[PDB]
Design a protein around this ligand. Sequence first.
Ligand SMILES: CCCCCCCCCCCC(=O)OC[C@H](COP(=O)(O)OCCN)OC(=O)CCCCCCCCC
Ligand SMILES: CCCCCCCCCCCC(=O)OC[C@H](COP(=O)(O)OCCN)OC(=O)CCCCCCCCC
Ligand SMILES: CCCCCCCCCCCC(=O)OC[C@H](COP(=O)(O)OCCN)OC(=O)CCCCCCCCC
Ligand SMILES: CCCCCCCCCCCC(=O)OC[C@H](COP(=O)(O)OCCN)OC(=O)CCCCCCCCC
Ligand SMILES: CC(C)Oc1cc(Cl)ccc1CNc1cc(-c2ccccc2)nc2ncnn12
Ligand SMILES: CC(C)Oc1cc(Cl)ccc1CNc1cc(-c2ccccc2)nc2ncnn12
Ligand SMILES: CCCCCCCCCCCCCCCCCCCCCCCCO
Ligand SMILES: CCCCCCCCCCCCCCCCCCCCCCCCO
Ligand SMILES: CCCCCCCC/C=C\CCCCCCCC(=O)NCCO
Ligand SMILES: CCCCCCCC/C=C\CCCCCCCC(=O)NCCO
Ligand SMILES: CCCCCCCCCCCCCCCCCCCCO
Ligand SMILES: CCCCCCCCCCCCCCCCCCCCO
Ligand SMILES: CCCCCCCCCCCCCCCCCCCCO
Ligand SMILES: CCCCCCCCCCCCCCCCCCCCO
Ligand SMILES: CCCCCCCCCCCCO
Ligand SMILES: CCCCCCCCCCCCO
Ligand SMILES: CCCCCCCCCCCCO
Ligand SMILES: CCCCCCCCCCCCO
Ligand SMILES: CCCCCCCCCCCCO
Ligand SMILES: CCCCCCCCCCCCO
Ligand SMILES: CCCCCCCCCCCCO
Ligand SMILES: CCCCCCCCCCCCO
Lengths: 196, 195, 254, 254
Amino acid sequence: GIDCSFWNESYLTGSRDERKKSLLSKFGMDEGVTFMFIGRFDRGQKGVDVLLKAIEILSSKKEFQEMRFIIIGKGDPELEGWARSLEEKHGNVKVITEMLSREFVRELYGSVDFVIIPSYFEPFGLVALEAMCLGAIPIASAVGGLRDIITNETGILVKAGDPGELANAILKALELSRSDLSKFRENCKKRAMSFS
Amino acid sequence: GIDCSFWNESYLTGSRDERKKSLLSKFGMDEGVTFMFIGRFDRGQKGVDVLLKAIEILSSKKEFQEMRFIIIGKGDPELEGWARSLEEKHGNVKVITEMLSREFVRELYGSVDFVIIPSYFEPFGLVALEAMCLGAIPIASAVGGLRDIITNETGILVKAGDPGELANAILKALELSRSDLSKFRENCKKRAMSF
Amino acid sequence: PLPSPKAWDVVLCISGTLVSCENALVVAIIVGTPAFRAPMFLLVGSLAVADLLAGLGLVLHFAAVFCIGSAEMSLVLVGVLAMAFTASIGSLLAITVDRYLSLYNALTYYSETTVTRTYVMLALVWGGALGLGLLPVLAWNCLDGLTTCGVVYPLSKNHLVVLAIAFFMVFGIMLQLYAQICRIVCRKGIATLAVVLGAFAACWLPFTVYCLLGDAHSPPLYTYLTLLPATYNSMINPIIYAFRNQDVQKVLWA
Amino acid sequence: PLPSPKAWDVVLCISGTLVSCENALVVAIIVGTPAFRAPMFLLVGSLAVADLLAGLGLVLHFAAVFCIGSAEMSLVLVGVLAMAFTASIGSLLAITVDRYLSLYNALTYYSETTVTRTYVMLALVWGGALGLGLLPVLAWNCLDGLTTCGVVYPLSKNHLVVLAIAFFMVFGIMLQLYAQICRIVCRKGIATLAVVLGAFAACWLPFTVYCLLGDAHSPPLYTYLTLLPATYNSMINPIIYAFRNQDVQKVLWA
Ligand SMILES: CCCCCCCCCCCC(=O)OC[C@H](COP(=O)(O)OCCN)OC(=O)CCCCCCCCC
Ligand SMILES: CCCCCCCCCCCC(=O)OC[C@H](COP(=O)(O)OCCN)OC(=O)CCCCCCCCC
Ligand SMILES: CCCCCCCCCCCC(=O)OC[C@H](COP(=O)(O)OCCN)OC(=O)CCCCCCCCC
Ligand SMILES: CCCCCCCCCCCC(=O)OC[C@H](COP(=O)(O)OCCN)OC(=O)CCCCCCCCC
Ligand SMILES: CC(C)Oc1cc(Cl)ccc1CNc1cc(-c2ccccc2)nc2ncnn12
Ligand SMILES: CC(C)Oc1cc(Cl)ccc1CNc1cc(-c2ccccc2)nc2ncnn12
Ligand SMILES: CCCCCCCCCCCCCCCCCCCCCCCCO
Ligand SMILES: CCCCCCCCCCCCCCCCCCCCCCCCO
Ligand SMILES: CCCCCCCC/C=C\CCCCCCCC(=O)NCCO
Ligand SMILES: CCCCCCCC/C=C\CCCCCCCC(=O)NCCO
Ligand SMILES: CCCCCCCCCCCCCCCCCCCCO
Ligand SMILES: CCCCCCCCCCCCCCCCCCCCO
Ligand SMILES: CCCCCCCCCCCCCCCCCCCCO
Ligand SMILES: CCCCCCCCCCCCCCCCCCCCO
Ligand SMILES: CCCCCCCCCCCCO
Ligand SMILES: CCCCCCCCCCCCO
Ligand SMILES: CCCCCCCCCCCCO
Ligand SMILES: CCCCCCCCCCCCO
Ligand SMILES: CCCCCCCCCCCCO
Ligand SMILES: CCCCCCCCCCCCO
Ligand SMILES: CCCCCCCCCCCCO
Ligand SMILES: CCCCCCCCCCCCO
């Protein structure tokens, strides 16, 4: 399953702040807390629609200008067009529909603050473990598989298919402090490395 | 494994020639026999380098102008740059590094004449069966797995990692007649569905 | 003149009582809430029903051979216990198969084929339990006096060997399934897998092995000493498979 | 000399000679060509070595009980046959797990961990064969009396039961391994799997089942009648696993 050696922060020379700033400059967005979603687009298995609806709901809020979103995936062309429209409407949203090499994914995990996994059902949860190994705080649905990996001290838990609750969780995570973020990242690394 | 209800010619509307011409126009190349390679790029498992070397060798031949090549894959950036340089040098070569949906893959299988599978080791060979189901004549290495599927009457067989033999096989396949191509497509469909 | 109960008979009666209580609780919880209708819950409910049948059979058999003197009522209950144990092991195998396919068929598991597969598994499990738990009734028992009686009195030697052969085949299948679950997961997960498989093995190998090395003339004590861990397994199944779920627990706390 | 061989022993000596000839040819082909050094060929050569040992053991055993009166040699040569059969049944499991891992780990199977795995599997197979073919020459022997000889005279009854238990555990693993290969493949590729598994079950079930339902007082004809199919399983192994390969055929038409 998890290599535990392919995924590690040691392979990345740059620091968290420097890597995040470089990645944001590459995408042409200013510095700030960024949330990344990776996975295929589909009706009711991965759940990109819930994330997009939550983003739309948050758009009416003033603090939405402080949040950056990176969406990676493919699938139904309607959802791809919806994501492209959201990207065009707001300058703090980016969409990457192309495939990415494992090195790029590893670099991303070590740069983005939070990884959103709002899946309807996910028996095992490789994505959560891979993100946690590089100190990425997850925000996942409380379904089987993700419930075991993520405890109260290693991330957040949200009800499946509840855009309002997902938006509330994002807003609440917006206030976490840098020291708390570092402690959470260390705890996530420990949980991912110890858990098989 | 293979989904017989997913890979079929029924889901395609136009005729073989019409789909081929439309795809070639979309890719901006003239009508002709087109050879497609789909797979990962790497050193010694799928052998894209063998196909690229064969194309380079064939470039010096006069008949090379009648061949079209579509290369789909990802991997070592050096090989990607080599493929891009080959595409730039010759107007009858195209490279697609993007990931494609299964519908596009089936359309390609139903459009291109020949599918090249010069892999060093293919224990099962899903690509061969998927290409055959839509009526694409394969040109595969004679390694385990591909040898079981492709008989003498359903395609060609070439020695693994021998660019000269691959070029010779491509040249030989360039001269097959339309009726022979139709018979080969029917035989390939029968063999693929039989499994 | 009813026979005098022994200490081991009382021990098995109380073990049956405890098993019945636990699995009645589990079955009531699952059948009560209408949200528990996924294939996992169907398989766990089948396991709980099998264990409850085994426990109730133990209690009734003790009450049918020492209190309600009867020679025809204590023979049906042996078949009932054989059916219960066979169905319990079949349900364990079905649960393991479902878990492995859910971890492997990540995207195709959530379909109608999963429901059809679960129904097929339940049909196979209970049909096999009933086919291999009707032999004591008429097909194979040593009651007549010319069928080489086995270690468990009413049953036959040719029947208790087929049961052991089937158990060892199922055990091999379970080992292979756990190998492919270990490969997908891989030290907490592996430790938990090892514990869950070790409980099953340590509980069911004693009897099924003594079942092949024993005769009708061996001491009757070895029966009880090897057939008690099987009851203990039926006792600890709900804890492993039902009460460790995070949806059953909230209903428990209600 | 004195025992005056019987009509059922010549039929077994000739089978031994045929098995020996076939597998000697296969081993000579494998060892002669230096290109055959992949893990597949190591496993298929181990299988051939095991079935050559079995055949030579049969021939020598027949020649040591009816031509060279010697109890010591016969006792030593029964253990050789037990080891040969154990190794020949372990090599099939090794081959099948290799096939499954090559079909599954399509890109990881060609790493350098497929050689360490093959060496580990060979060590396990030929260590288990020697551990479970060390019993006749060891404590678990029935020669001294009071140890309840099994269906095969020199061997004990606990040793044969342990061997049968191990076979049924290993038979279940093959069922799951083929149930996993069917999903990868899946009409003409399922028929071959069914035939290859039937040729193994139909050949080895008779003995391993009679091994549990039999006794020292059973007629001696059943041992011959159930141990002949087991011998004939070493005649079709080279055809299924060695002569059906195309490189091997190319080397053979010279
Ligand atoms: C998803 C929507 C909800 C649908 C719910 C119905 C599906 C079947 C659930 C059965 C689960 C179970 O606990 O089995 C116990 C009985 C046997 O109990 P017995 O009295 O102790 O023993 C008597 C022996 N039979 O299980 C069975 O009988 C197995 C039934 C097999 C057929 C599967 C259902 C077919 C319906 C289409
Ligand atoms: C996946 C691993 C598990 C594999 C299980 C292997 C066991 C199969 C063998 C069945 C033979 C048997 O014992 O049948 C008993 C009765 C017959 O008793 P009788 O002949 O009537 O006695 C003499 C009468 N005068 O069988 C039946 O009643 C028929 C039902 C057979 C049930 C087998 C179902 C297996 C489904 C998995
Ligand atoms: C890449 C080049 C490879 C070089 C060769 C590697 C050797 C692997 C073994 C070959 C197959 C075989 O039949 O083994 C038989 C021997 C025993 O035969 P015995 O005479 O009938 O019975 C006596 C019982 N031992 O058994 C063994 O192989 C024992 C396991 C050894 C495997 C590890 C070898 C370490 C090499 C580093
Ligand atoms: C996947 C298939 C699983 C196989 C499961 C069966 C395992 C058998 C375990 C214990 C029985 C046994 O091996 O006999 C003990 C031997 C015999 O010695 P002795 O006659 O009792 O000596 C007494 C002297 N007075 O003990 C040994 O010789 C030690 C070797 C044990 C071999 C087990 C190897 C298994 C590797 C797979
Ligand atoms: C020869 C022996 C190990 O066979 C077995 C024994 C048990 Cl107890 C369980 C299972 C099997 C065979 N299944 C198996 C084995 C191995 C493997 C890895 C390393 C060394 C040796 C074997 N890997 C696998 N991956 C998926 N199945 N599987
Ligand atoms: C209950 C019975 C079927 O269990 C088995 C019996 C045998 Cl002979 C072999 C194996 C198994 C369990 N392995 C298994 C079963 C099924 C399955 C598919 C449809 C209906 C029911 C079961 N699919 C699977 N895919 C990978 N393993 N596997
Ligand atoms: C002369 C005959 C002698 C034979 C006697 C044999 C006795 C063998 C002991 C068998 C009884 C012990 C059963 C072990 C079960 C252990 C696991 C506990 C799991 C608890 C849940 C953990 C949840 C996390 O997963
Ligand atoms: C006391 C009575 C008990 C008697 C028990 C007798 C049981 C009968 C056993 C019969 C032995 C033979 C069984 C071989 C069957 C396999 C066919 C050949 C496969 C080889 C070609 C495959 C090529 C493509 O894969
Ligand atoms: C897909 C099919 C699944 C089949 C699995 C087969 C497992 C059967 C193994 C073991 C079943 C053992 C049955 C217990 C014997 C009877 C106990 C008893 O009689 N106690 C009398 C009270 O004194
Ligand atoms: C990973 C370990 C693999 C172990 C697999 C275990 C299989 C053993 C099963 C069966 C082995 C049966 C052995 C034959 C008995 C002896 C035959 C005989 O003695 N004939 C005397 C001539 O008259
Ligand atoms: C799960 C699918 C795999 C194949 C299973 C094959 C069945 C093996 C067990 C046979 C038991 C068959 C035992 C029969 C008992 C015969 C005694 C007759 C009377 C003696 O006088
Ligand atoms: C694998 C994880 C740990 C658990 C393993 C326990 C396995 C022990 C087998 C005990 C066999 C117990 C068989 C005892 C037979 C008693 C003598 C018979 C006398 C006939 O008259
Ligand atoms: C691969 C995982 C396997 C788990 C362990 C299997 C153990 C069962 C086999 C029989 C054990 C050994 C049975 C005990 C030996 C019989 C004689 C003892 C009594 C002397 O009077
Ligand atoms: C898929 C192909 C499977 C074919 C094999 C089926 C199983 C054969 C059963 C062997 C019966 C073994 C018969 C035992 C004979 C009676 C011995 C009793 C002696 C009492 O002292
Ligand atoms: C957890 C297993 C509990 C075993 C309880 C055994 C108690 C037996 C005591 C009475 C035996 C008759 O002398
Ligand atoms: C499962 C163990 C708990 C039950 C213990 C019962 C022991 C009773 C043995 C003494 C008999 C008294 O009549
Ligand atoms: C003795 C056990 C035999 C098991 C065979 C069951 C195969 C039925 C497949 C049903 C279709 C599953 O989608
Ligand atoms: C015999 C036990 C077989 C299971 C071995 C699996 C565990 C070894 C590490 C596997 C590496 C992940 O693919
Ligand atoms: C593979 C078996 C071939 C048939 C062998 C027949 C031998 C029977 C000999 C019986 C009379 C003694 O010469
Ligand atoms: C599968 C091949 C079976 C051929 C050998 C059967 C025995 C034939 C000769 C008769 C020996 C009994 O006197
Ligand atoms: C009963 C024998 C089971 C022993 C299994 C040994 C597994 C060792 C793992 C070796 C890892 C090689 O990838
Ligand atoms: C009992 C045999 C179990 C395996 C049978 C599976 C055959 C049908 C599977 C078709 C779907 C491929 O993923």
